[PDB]
Amino acid sequence: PIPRRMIATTCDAEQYLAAVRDTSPVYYQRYMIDFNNHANLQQATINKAHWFFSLSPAERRDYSEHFYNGDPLTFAWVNHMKIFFNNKGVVAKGTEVCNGYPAGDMSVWNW
Ligand SMILES: [Cl-]
Structure with missing residues (x-):
């Protein structure tokens, strides 16, 4: 469900998105x-x-289950975490380099 590289990444959400x-x-x-x-x-x-990005490798591994079983967001917008979780190609290329991007850069959410 959650790629192994997202479990492991030490990047934050904005570094990954950038x-x-x-x-x-x-x-x-x-x-x-x-x-x-x-x-x-x-x-x-x-x-x-x-x-999610505040959790440890092991904890994120633990979350894989709870993610699967869904929350309000999962039924209201199934693809809400799609960029983070869904394609292992995208995830590999993102997690390769994201440590070189600026932490906390919220403009990456603003298209
Ligand atoms: Cl909405």
Whole structure:
């Protein structure tokens, strides 16, 4: 469910997103289109992503289950974490380089 590299990454959400923006631009733009079509859920999505990136490798491994079983966000916008979790190619290229991007750069959420 959650790729092994996302379990392991020491990057934060904005470093990862900026890395995807650069290394898989089509996936980033499609995610942002989807994000901006769910405006009511944007902050929730951001808080979730922050929360996930605060967990340890082992804890994120533990989360894999609870993620699967869904939360409000998962039934309201299935693809809310799609950029983070769904394609192992995108995830590999993002997690390769994201440590070179600026932590906390919230403009990556703002398309
Ligand atoms: Cl919405």
